[PDB]
Amino acid sequence: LMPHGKGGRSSVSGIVATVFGATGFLGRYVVNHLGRMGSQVIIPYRCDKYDIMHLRPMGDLGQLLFLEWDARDKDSIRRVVQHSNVVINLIGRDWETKNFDFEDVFVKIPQAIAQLSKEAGVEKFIHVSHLNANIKSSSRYLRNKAVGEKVVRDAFPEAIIVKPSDIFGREDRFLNSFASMHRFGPIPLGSLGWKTVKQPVYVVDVSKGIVNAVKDPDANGKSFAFVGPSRYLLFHLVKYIFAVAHRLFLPFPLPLFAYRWVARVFEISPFEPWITRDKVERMHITDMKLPHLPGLEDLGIQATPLELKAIEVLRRHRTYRWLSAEIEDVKPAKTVN
Amino acid sequence: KLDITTLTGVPEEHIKTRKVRIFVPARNNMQSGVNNTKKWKMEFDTRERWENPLMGWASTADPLSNMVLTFSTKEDAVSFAEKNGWSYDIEERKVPKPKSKSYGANFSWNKRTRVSTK
Amino acid sequence: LGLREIRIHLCQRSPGSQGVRDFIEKRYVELKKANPDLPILIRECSDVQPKLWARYAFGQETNVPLNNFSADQVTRALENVLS
Amino acid sequence: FVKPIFSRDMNEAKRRVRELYRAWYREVPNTVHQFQLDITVKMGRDKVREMFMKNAHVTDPRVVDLLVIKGKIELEETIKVWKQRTHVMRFFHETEAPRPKDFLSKFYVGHDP
Amino acid sequence: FWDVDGSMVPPEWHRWLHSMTDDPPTTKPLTARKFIWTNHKFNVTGTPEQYVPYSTTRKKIQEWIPPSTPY
Amino acid sequence: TRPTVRPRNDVAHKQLSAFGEYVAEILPKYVQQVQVSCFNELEVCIHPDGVIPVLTFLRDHTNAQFKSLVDLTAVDVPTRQNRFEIVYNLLSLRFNSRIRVKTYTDELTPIESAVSVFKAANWYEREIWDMFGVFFANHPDLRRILTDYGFEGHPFRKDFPLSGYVELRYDDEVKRVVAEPVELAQEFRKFDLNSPWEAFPVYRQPPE
Amino acid sequence: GVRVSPTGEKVTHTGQVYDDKDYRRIRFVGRQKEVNENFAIDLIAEQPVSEVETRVIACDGGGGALGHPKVYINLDKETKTGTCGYCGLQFRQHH
Amino acid sequence: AILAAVSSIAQKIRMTSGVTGDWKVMNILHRIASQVAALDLGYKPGVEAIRKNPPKVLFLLGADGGCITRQDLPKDCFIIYQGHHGDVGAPIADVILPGAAYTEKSATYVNTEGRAQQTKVAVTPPGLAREDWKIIRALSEIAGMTLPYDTLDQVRNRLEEVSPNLVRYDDIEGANYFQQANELSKLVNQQLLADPLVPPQLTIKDFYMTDSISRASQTMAKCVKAVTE
Ligand SMILES: NC(=O)C1=CN([C@@H]2O[C@H](COP(=O)(O)OP(=O)(O)OC[C@H]3O[C@@H](n4cnc5c(N)ncnc54)[C@H](OP(=O)(O)O)[C@@H]3O)[C@@H](O)[C@H]2O)C=CC1
């Protein structure tokens, strides 16, 4: 169908999303943005009914749908994508689950989703990789994205390839881990952070951008690479993270392999690690500065600086002596440009 | 122009977007009763109301749409729309013109009224 | 460019319209005779002032009000707008 | 004509509003910290300047003074640490979509007026 | 059992536990009309059986038919 | 004329009437109509500039100690320029009498506050302030009763929709409850049950 | 034996089943659309037509004050049955 | 010919006198809902002899298959359309632009007596249909020649600076130009009278199918089949 009513929760739009990865961090956001517009949204889930219960407010009566399905089965994926007009994809896992090898997460599954999306006659199959995807010996998960990027690029050739970099949000793994270091005590870094630089991307912007990307006919085979407003060097970046966390800061150098070993000690747990050999290099990798790829403002959405977003994300960690403190007083981290 | 545009709580959007309709309501065609032609009333212009995707219900846009207001006189209603800041359109009263009638007027060979069997 | 459509407005009863009324009752047959092409639309409307629209190239229009003008002055404007 | 609320002519009223602005303009950080607003404080002061702009077409001193009566009454609920953070954020409407005043987009959206 | 609940009772006996009727349906069996259900399926909010509200009374405007002929 | 009909109590109507002229004597300056229906229910006008001086007198004995402001019942009729119709229900306990004494006001008329006189109207105050906008003489606080915090509207103005313009809901990424534009489903499907053909000729305002 | 839609789900007794294009059909997935087995329509004409040699008749729907208001069915035309405005069941005057 | 004839007839009956003279004896019954306003704006006589070379004619309704068809331009058949029912005109057209029905728009209409009376909004257009002239203001807005007025109330504001009678509703009355100046150019032409003279509608059975709504209405089909057999 086609839109009716003022753009809101009760007004309609023709959207029929099938957001894989809704269970995770980004997914609840993108579902919030599809749902806020009054578009109906399928939400296929595997974790459990309880895990996504919090999403129920986001919809309005009929606007949301929930669907259990096995990743291992193909036919279930066929069922969930049937009436889909658009099919957003967000399946991933940084630390690599034991029972499901990391390979499948960015190879077999994205491909099946792509072919079946083609059979579904999906108006807009969409896939989200990362700005660091060009093949690197570092970060197999990062390396795997490139293969998923291509397989998705082929099985469903007009698929968009989103490449967000270090999106930071309230529940972001990347921002929180840095904040969580105070419990660790000491602050190791691979040759500190001076060699490497990053340009982190705010998540609500990425989500609303996915929405407007769905809204744009013009995008198709386009390989979007989302980028942050500012290109901070990693070390001064951590400086800022505790500068707002107000926690004691004691940086020191640590060899990449030696840090890699401790990360390996932390990978032993079936319980999810705060640290992993993927995370090591995925941190130590620099963000590529790409101009040629389409701008964020092409979607019409302005980039939102981390300094305007940080304290809410990190207030929970700052001590009561600081937990009620004014925002302006931390002073912004130094920019490489 | 004693505008109470801010003194009222109404959104500026609903006062900008539309004019209201001042008028005197019409008598039922299907019914004899003249009784509701009396007393002026003012009503806002209807907007689009998309169907509810579920259960096929009405899904109204503008909240204020069901408003209705009686008035003793026309200048009264004009005064309200002026006080309140909304645009309006005055409409005239429609009392039917008197018609001469008589029982015998139906008859008479010459008048070609005649009617017929009774 | 000189004209495409021309038109005038006129109070039905007002004194400032009356000489113009007398004019339309007379010479308008002559002026209308002069121009088989370009229309000279005329309106009865009791707009507060008698009026003179005259479209030219690309829809642009002159607009001289005719309040308190004698029909001779009206015509005096009329030859002026032949082009 | 009819008897005035408080101020008569604009200056008796104009005096009251400035009293109001400072009454907000100083109060703002207090609010920024009581509710721990994530907004930078200058944004707060800017909003303070903006709500004082929406009332620009006011011309009757009874309308001015009644507006500062209600505005100070809102300041009551603000200073007493009543309301909640959400109520403070109601002035922003940030959840809501931006409105394109452009008519062409208004054509593109829906039936509308 | 170890999942027993309400709605397990049949409607006649459902009238009987609530003591709307002193007399058990045994003595006075009910009308047994053709269209009434027999197994009595009880409440089922979970599981694949599940009520679904939906749009009723078909269509509205009937959108105009596109031509199939070229030119 | 009886089994269904409620009997008409002429006696109390007589006494209330006579007392009504009595009061009509006593305060010519503000008192106007002396309405006296067969419900045994007396009523009287007051000019708004005359709110306090009358009411105080009422509390004090003459032959009716109008103790206890039971109500400041309020009505809004948009037609009249004096749209507001503030009403003082009253009850002289010693005389077991009841009376209804009302007024009128415009949107910017600071009608007198009986807060000093009754204090019961510390809230009849703020409700009838808030629901309306009937500004009041001098009250310790005009902070709103009932309606929320940032809420702008004045429901019971018999103006703007019964749903109102406002409909709040919790929202996700803002982590908080937020007011939003209405979007009612199904809509209040109002029935116009008004009946052409008058049933009460005895009433009936003349066409004039 | 409700008529089956091309999608395979049964149509409502007021026929209106969703189009194959229709995305909305997704709602029924993982669940069961429900439609009544006992259409009243068949049951209307299923009944034998009552006939009385008289003339005007008075149906009550069976059950005094347990059914429709008393109604006087005419039988002026033997060319047709006298269906009730309420019961929906036919009548005729046999002779 | 019948025009000059009847004008001569009414003038002749004026010559018979006994007429008050303000009687305005000369009058006709229009059956069309649109030509009367277009002639209040005096666009053109509406002569179809124009159907010559022009490519890319725009369709407003275009309900008849008669007066116009795609033989006007042998080359391009590109022809824009903005009706609401698809009958007759729509298929011929290409790059179709859907638009509102009458109750939905608040757009005005002129009675044949010169009475002006606007339509008011009702159920609003069913889907992607919108206000009729709004698409025009959009095309002009893209055309690099945007219209100065914005609201429909403002196009009504423009009607005073041109019509100027569309702004006034119940005002049937006006100055009335009188047969003097009228008749004089009528007699400076003259046309041959002819045979025959038959009403378009003939009988009842033919009366059920005129405009796209009357055409497409199902009650009309059932009713015409009723009057047939
Ligand atoms: N900053 C960032 O986080 C960035 C992320 N990306 C990429 O974008 C995607 C979105 O990130 P994010 O949502 O934070 O990651 P999450 O882990 O939060 O989202 C992944 C979700 O998909 C589910 N899932 C995926 N595959 C399976 C499977 N086979 N079986 C069961 N569940 C599965 C996960 O578990 P379940 O649903 O079962 O709970 C989880 O809920 C990721 O894939 C990531 O690689 C790219 C750039 C930056």
mmCIF file of N, CA, C and O in Angstrom, chain C residues 5-70:
data_model
loop_
_atom_site.group_PDB
_atom_site.id
_atom_site.type_symbol
_atom_site.label_atom_id
_atom_site.label_comp_id
_atom_site.label_asym_id
_atom_site.label_seq_id
_atom_site.Cartn_x
_atom_site.Cartn_y
_atom_site.Cartn_z
ATOM 1 N N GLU C 5 -5.267 39.204 -23.924
ATOM 2 C CA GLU C 5 -6.618 39.329 -23.404
ATOM 3 C C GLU C 5 -6.686 40.622 -22.622
ATOM 4 O O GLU C 5 -5.731 40.989 -21.946
ATOM 5 N N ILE C 6 -7.812 41.316 -22.697
ATOM 6 C CA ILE C 6 -7.965 42.515 -21.890
ATOM 7 C C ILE C 6 -9.338 42.448 -21.253
ATOM 8 O O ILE C 6 -10.243 41.832 -21.809
ATOM 9 N N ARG C 7 -9.499 43.036 -20.075
ATOM 10 C CA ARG C 7 -10.780 42.935 -19.395
ATOM 11 C C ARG C 7 -11.029 44.084 -18.429
ATOM 12 O O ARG C 7 -10.096 44.731 -17.968
ATOM 13 N N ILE C 8 -12.300 44.342 -18.135
ATOM 14 C CA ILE C 8 -12.664 45.449 -17.264
ATOM 15 C C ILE C 8 -13.732 45.072 -16.251
ATOM 16 O O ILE C 8 -14.488 44.123 -16.448
ATOM 17 N N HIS C 9 -13.784 45.838 -15.167
ATOM 18 C CA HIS C 9 -14.728 45.602 -14.089
ATOM 19 C C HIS C 9 -15.538 46.871 -13.851
ATOM 20 O O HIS C 9 -15.059 47.973 -14.120
ATOM 21 N N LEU C 10 -16.753 46.716 -13.334
ATOM 22 C CA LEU C 10 -17.711 47.816 -13.301
ATOM 23 C C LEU C 10 -18.803 47.689 -12.239
ATOM 24 O O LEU C 10 -19.539 46.707 -12.218
ATOM 25 N N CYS C 11 -18.925 48.699 -11.379
ATOM 26 C CA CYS C 11 -20.029 48.748 -10.424
ATOM 27 C C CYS C 11 -21.340 48.891 -11.176
ATOM 28 O O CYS C 11 -21.436 49.689 -12.102
ATOM 29 N N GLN C 12 -22.358 48.142 -10.767
ATOM 30 C CA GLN C 12 -23.637 48.182 -11.465
ATOM 31 C C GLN C 12 -24.367 49.516 -11.319
ATOM 32 O O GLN C 12 -25.165 49.884 -12.178
ATOM 33 N N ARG C 13 -24.090 50.250 -10.246
ATOM 34 C CA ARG C 13 -24.897 51.424 -9.933
ATOM 35 C C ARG C 13 -24.075 52.669 -9.578
ATOM 36 O O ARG C 13 -24.565 53.795 -9.702
ATOM 37 N N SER C 14 -22.824 52.475 -9.168
ATOM 38 C CA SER C 14 -22.016 53.574 -8.646
ATOM 39 C C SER C 14 -21.761 54.666 -9.680
ATOM 40 O O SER C 14 -21.567 54.380 -10.859
ATOM 41 N N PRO C 15 -21.762 55.933 -9.222
ATOM 42 C CA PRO C 15 -21.536 57.116 -10.059
ATOM 43 C C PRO C 15 -20.201 57.076 -10.794
ATOM 44 O O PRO C 15 -20.109 57.579 -11.916
ATOM 45 N N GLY C 16 -19.187 56.479 -10.175
ATOM 46 C CA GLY C 16 -17.873 56.415 -10.786
ATOM 47 C C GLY C 16 -17.837 55.392 -11.902
ATOM 48 O O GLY C 16 -16.908 55.380 -12.709
ATOM 49 N N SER C 17 -18.847 54.524 -11.941
ATOM 50 C CA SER C 17 -18.979 53.532 -13.003
ATOM 51 C C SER C 17 -19.929 53.959 -14.122
ATOM 52 O O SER C 17 -19.916 53.376 -15.205
ATOM 53 N N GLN C 18 -20.756 54.965 -13.857
ATOM 54 C CA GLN C 18 -21.882 55.270 -14.733
ATOM 55 C C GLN C 18 -21.500 55.749 -16.134
ATOM 56 O O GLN C 18 -22.135 55.363 -17.119
ATOM 57 N N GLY C 19 -20.451 56.560 -16.230
ATOM 58 C CA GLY C 19 -20.023 57.072 -17.521
ATOM 59 C C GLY C 19 -19.475 55.927 -18.344
ATOM 60 O O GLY C 19 -19.670 55.850 -19.561
ATOM 61 N N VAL C 20 -18.793 55.019 -17.656
ATOM 62 C CA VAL C 20 -18.289 53.807 -18.276
ATOM 63 C C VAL C 20 -19.439 52.921 -18.743
ATOM 64 O O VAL C 20 -19.348 52.266 -19.782
ATOM 65 N N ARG C 21 -20.533 52.922 -17.983
ATOM 66 C CA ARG C 21 -21.703 52.133 -18.345
ATOM 67 C C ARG C 21 -22.288 52.670 -19.633
ATOM 68 O O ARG C 21 -22.642 51.917 -20.548
ATOM 69 N N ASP C 22 -22.354 53.990 -19.701
ATOM 70 C CA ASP C 22 -22.873 54.661 -20.874
ATOM 71 C C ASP C 22 -21.971 54.349 -22.059
ATOM 72 O O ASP C 22 -22.442 54.165 -23.189
ATOM 73 N N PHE C 23 -20.675 54.231 -21.781
ATOM 74 C CA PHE C 23 -19.716 53.937 -22.832
ATOM 75 C C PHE C 23 -19.903 52.542 -23.399
ATOM 76 O O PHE C 23 -19.921 52.355 -24.617
ATOM 77 N N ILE C 24 -20.030 51.561 -22.517
ATOM 78 C CA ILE C 24 -20.187 50.190 -22.959
ATOM 79 C C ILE C 24 -21.503 50.050 -23.707
ATOM 80 O O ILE C 24 -21.605 49.291 -24.670
ATOM 81 N N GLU C 25 -22.503 50.814 -23.278
ATOM 82 C CA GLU C 25 -23.762 50.845 -24.006
ATOM 83 C C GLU C 25 -23.615 51.506 -25.375
ATOM 84 O O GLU C 25 -24.393 51.219 -26.282
ATOM 85 N N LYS C 26 -22.620 52.377 -25.545
ATOM 86 C CA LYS C 26 -22.390 52.936 -26.879
ATOM 87 C C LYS C 26 -21.194 52.323 -27.633
ATOM 88 O O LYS C 26 -21.352 51.323 -28.330
ATOM 89 N N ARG C 27 -20.007 52.895 -27.463
ATOM 90 C CA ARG C 27 -18.893 52.729 -28.397
ATOM 91 C C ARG C 27 -18.264 51.343 -28.364
ATOM 92 O O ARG C 27 -17.423 51.009 -29.210
ATOM 93 N N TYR C 28 -18.651 50.545 -27.375
ATOM 94 C CA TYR C 28 -18.061 49.230 -27.212
ATOM 95 C C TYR C 28 -18.276 48.377 -28.447
ATOM 96 O O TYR C 28 -17.464 47.513 -28.755
ATOM 97 N N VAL C 29 -19.367 48.624 -29.157
ATOM 98 C CA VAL C 29 -19.606 47.922 -30.404
ATOM 99 C C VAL C 29 -18.535 48.306 -31.420
ATOM 100 O O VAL C 29 -18.087 47.474 -32.209
ATOM 101 N N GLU C 30 -18.094 49.562 -31.369
ATOM 102 C CA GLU C 30 -17.050 50.028 -32.270
ATOM 103 C C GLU C 30 -15.698 49.435 -31.921
ATOM 104 O O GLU C 30 -14.996 48.917 -32.788
ATOM 105 N N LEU C 31 -15.323 49.515 -30.647
ATOM 106 C CA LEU C 31 -14.021 48.997 -30.256
ATOM 107 C C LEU C 31 -13.955 47.498 -30.461
ATOM 108 O O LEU C 31 -12.930 46.969 -30.886
ATOM 109 N N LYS C 32 -15.059 46.822 -30.170
ATOM 110 C CA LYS C 32 -15.140 45.384 -30.365
ATOM 111 C C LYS C 32 -15.079 45.083 -31.848
ATOM 112 O O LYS C 32 -14.572 44.040 -32.262
ATOM 113 N N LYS C 33 -15.602 46.007 -32.646
ATOM 114 C CA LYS C 33 -15.523 45.884 -34.093
ATOM 115 C C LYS C 33 -14.079 46.005 -34.560
ATOM 116 O O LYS C 33 -13.680 45.387 -35.547
ATOM 117 N N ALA C 34 -13.296 46.801 -33.841
ATOM 118 C CA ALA C 34 -11.902 47.021 -34.203
ATOM 119 C C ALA C 34 -11.034 45.776 -34.046
ATOM 120 O O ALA C 34 -10.048 45.609 -34.764
ATOM 121 N N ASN C 35 -11.396 44.908 -33.107
ATOM 122 C CA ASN C 35 -10.532 43.783 -32.749
ATOM 123 C C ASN C 35 -11.223 42.421 -32.699
ATOM 124 O O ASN C 35 -11.650 41.964 -31.643
ATOM 125 N N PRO C 36 -11.351 41.773 -33.865
ATOM 126 C CA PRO C 36 -11.883 40.407 -33.929
ATOM 127 C C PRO C 36 -11.046 39.426 -33.107
ATOM 128 O O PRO C 36 -11.593 38.459 -32.573
ATOM 129 N N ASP C 37 -9.743 39.674 -33.014
ATOM 130 C CA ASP C 37 -8.833 38.804 -32.266
ATOM 131 C C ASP C 37 -8.988 38.903 -30.754
ATOM 132 O O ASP C 37 -9.622 38.058 -30.123
ATOM 133 N N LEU C 38 -8.391 39.944 -30.187
ATOM 134 C CA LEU C 38 -8.177 40.035 -28.751
ATOM 135 C C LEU C 38 -9.465 40.339 -27.995
ATOM 136 O O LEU C 38 -10.098 41.365 -28.237
ATOM 137 N N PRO C 39 -9.851 39.450 -27.070
ATOM 138 C CA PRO C 39 -11.059 39.660 -26.270
ATOM 139 C C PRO C 39 -10.981 40.870 -25.342
ATOM 140 O O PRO C 39 -9.924 41.166 -24.772
ATOM 141 N N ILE C 40 -12.121 41.533 -25.174
ATOM 142 C CA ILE C 40 -12.258 42.603 -24.204
ATOM 143 C C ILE C 40 -13.351 42.188 -23.225
ATOM 144 O O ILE C 40 -14.484 42.669 -23.294
ATOM 145 N N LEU C 41 -13.014 41.262 -22.337
ATOM 146 C CA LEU C 41 -13.968 40.730 -21.377
ATOM 147 C C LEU C 41 -14.454 41.830 -20.446
ATOM 148 O O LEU C 41 -13.691 42.706 -20.063
ATOM 149 N N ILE C 42 -15.729 41.798 -20.089
ATOM 150 C CA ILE C 42 -16.283 42.851 -19.252
ATOM 151 C C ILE C 42 -17.119 42.234 -18.148
ATOM 152 O O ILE C 42 -17.871 41.290 -18.387
ATOM 153 N N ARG C 43 -17.002 42.768 -16.936
ATOM 154 C CA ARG C 43 -17.732 42.198 -15.817
ATOM 155 C C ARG C 43 -18.590 43.209 -15.077
ATOM 156 O O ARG C 43 -18.248 44.384 -14.959
ATOM 157 N N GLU C 44 -19.717 42.711 -14.590
ATOM 158 C CA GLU C 44 -20.742 43.514 -13.950
ATOM 159 C C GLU C 44 -20.431 43.777 -12.485
ATOM 160 O O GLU C 44 -21.163 44.503 -11.813
ATOM 161 N N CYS C 45 -19.354 43.173 -11.995
ATOM 162 C CA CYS C 45 -19.136 43.044 -10.558
ATOM 163 C C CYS C 45 -19.077 44.371 -9.828
ATOM 164 O O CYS C 45 -18.390 45.299 -10.244
ATOM 165 N N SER C 46 -19.787 44.430 -8.707
ATOM 166 C CA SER C 46 -19.841 45.633 -7.899
ATOM 167 C C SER C 46 -18.645 45.670 -6.968
ATOM 168 O O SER C 46 -18.771 45.977 -5.783
ATOM 169 N N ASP C 47 -17.483 45.344 -7.522
ATOM 170 C CA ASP C 47 -16.225 45.557 -6.835
ATOM 171 C C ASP C 47 -16.110 47.048 -6.585
ATOM 172 O O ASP C 47 -16.588 47.840 -7.389
ATOM 173 N N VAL C 48 -15.475 47.435 -5.486
ATOM 174 C CA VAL C 48 -15.559 48.810 -5.001
ATOM 175 C C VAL C 48 -15.098 49.811 -6.061
ATOM 176 O O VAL C 48 -15.585 50.943 -6.120
ATOM 177 N N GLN C 49 -14.194 49.381 -6.931
ATOM 178 C CA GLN C 49 -13.735 50.244 -8.006
ATOM 179 C C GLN C 49 -13.847 49.566 -9.361
ATOM 180 O O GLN C 49 -13.638 48.359 -9.478
ATOM 181 N N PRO C 50 -14.196 50.345 -10.396
ATOM 182 C CA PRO C 50 -14.144 49.867 -11.777
ATOM 183 C C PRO C 50 -12.690 49.584 -12.145
ATOM 184 O O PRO C 50 -11.813 50.289 -11.650
ATOM 185 N N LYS C 51 -12.427 48.592 -12.991
ATOM 186 C CA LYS C 51 -11.061 48.096 -13.121
ATOM 187 C C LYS C 51 -10.675 47.794 -14.567
ATOM 188 O O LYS C 51 -11.538 47.627 -15.415
ATOM 189 N N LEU C 52 -9.372 47.755 -14.842
ATOM 190 C CA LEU C 52 -8.860 47.474 -16.181
ATOM 191 C C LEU C 52 -7.632 46.576 -16.156
ATOM 192 O O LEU C 52 -6.505 47.055 -16.005
ATOM 193 N N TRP C 53 -7.857 45.272 -16.260
ATOM 194 C CA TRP C 53 -6.778 44.335 -16.544
ATOM 195 C C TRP C 53 -6.423 44.306 -18.019
ATOM 196 O O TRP C 53 -7.285 44.490 -18.873
ATOM 197 N N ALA C 54 -5.155 44.040 -18.311
ATOM 198 C CA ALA C 54 -4.695 43.885 -19.684
ATOM 199 C C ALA C 54 -3.450 43.013 -19.735
ATOM 200 O O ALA C 54 -2.352 43.468 -19.414
ATOM 201 N N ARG C 55 -3.629 41.753 -20.119
ATOM 202 C CA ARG C 55 -2.507 40.832 -20.220
ATOM 203 C C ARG C 55 -1.600 41.188 -21.381
ATOM 204 O O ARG C 55 -2.071 41.602 -22.433
ATOM 205 N N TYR C 56 -0.297 41.022 -21.190
ATOM 206 C CA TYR C 56 0.644 41.157 -22.292
ATOM 207 C C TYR C 56 1.412 39.857 -22.471
ATOM 208 O O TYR C 56 0.860 38.774 -22.288
ATOM 209 N N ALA C 57 2.685 39.975 -22.827
ATOM 210 C CA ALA C 57 3.533 38.812 -23.041
ATOM 211 C C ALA C 57 3.734 38.019 -21.756
ATOM 212 O O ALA C 57 3.918 38.592 -20.685
ATOM 213 N N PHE C 58 3.699 36.696 -21.880
ATOM 214 C CA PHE C 58 3.916 35.786 -20.759
ATOM 215 C C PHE C 58 3.041 36.067 -19.539
ATOM 216 O O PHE C 58 3.470 35.894 -18.403
ATOM 217 N N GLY C 59 1.816 36.504 -19.786
ATOM 218 C CA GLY C 59 0.801 36.542 -18.751
ATOM 219 C C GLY C 59 0.829 37.754 -17.846
ATOM 220 O O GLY C 59 -0.034 37.900 -16.981
ATOM 221 N N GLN C 60 1.807 38.635 -18.041
ATOM 222 C CA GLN C 60 1.892 39.845 -17.233
ATOM 223 C C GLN C 60 0.693 40.730 -17.531
ATOM 224 O O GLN C 60 0.244 40.802 -18.674
ATOM 225 N N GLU C 61 0.164 41.398 -16.514
ATOM 226 C CA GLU C 61 -1.069 42.152 -16.697
ATOM 227 C C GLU C 61 -1.015 43.543 -16.078
ATOM 228 O O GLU C 61 -0.667 43.693 -14.910
ATOM 229 N N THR C 62 -1.350 44.558 -16.868
ATOM 230 C CA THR C 62 -1.568 45.893 -16.313
ATOM 231 C C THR C 62 -2.930 45.942 -15.634
ATOM 232 O O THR C 62 -3.839 45.198 -15.996
ATOM 233 N N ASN C 63 -3.068 46.817 -14.646
ATOM 234 C CA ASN C 63 -4.298 46.898 -13.874
ATOM 235 C C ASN C 63 -4.634 48.313 -13.408
ATOM 236 O O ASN C 63 -4.323 48.703 -12.285
ATOM 237 N N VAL C 64 -5.276 49.087 -14.270
ATOM 238 C CA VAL C 64 -5.649 50.441 -13.874
ATOM 239 C C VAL C 64 -7.079 50.490 -13.359
ATOM 240 O O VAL C 64 -8.006 50.166 -14.089
ATOM 241 N N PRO C 65 -7.260 50.888 -12.093
ATOM 242 C CA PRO C 65 -8.598 51.115 -11.535
ATOM 243 C C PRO C 65 -9.313 52.243 -12.266
ATOM 244 O O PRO C 65 -8.657 53.183 -12.702
ATOM 245 N N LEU C 66 -10.630 52.143 -12.406
ATOM 246 C CA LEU C 66 -11.391 53.117 -13.179
ATOM 247 C C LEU C 66 -12.277 54.007 -12.319
ATOM 248 O O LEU C 66 -13.227 54.605 -12.821
ATOM 249 N N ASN C 67 -11.986 54.080 -11.026
ATOM 250 C CA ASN C 67 -12.775 54.907 -10.122
ATOM 251 C C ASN C 67 -12.682 56.382 -10.502
ATOM 252 O O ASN C 67 -11.598 56.884 -10.795
ATOM 253 N N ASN C 68 -13.826 57.061 -10.485
ATOM 254 C CA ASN C 68 -13.924 58.487 -10.807
ATOM 255 C C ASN C 68 -13.267 58.895 -12.121
ATOM 256 O O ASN C 68 -12.583 59.915 -12.181
ATOM 257 N N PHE C 69 -13.474 58.099 -13.165
ATOM 258 C CA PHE C 69 -12.987 58.436 -14.501
ATOM 259 C C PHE C 69 -14.148 58.534 -15.489
ATOM 260 O O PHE C 69 -15.024 57.671 -15.509
ATOM 261 N N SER C 70 -14.154 59.585 -16.305
ATOM 262 C CA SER C 70 -15.152 59.723 -17.363
ATOM 263 C C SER C 70 -14.851 58.765 -18.506
ATOM 264 O O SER C 70 -13.703 58.373 -18.704
#
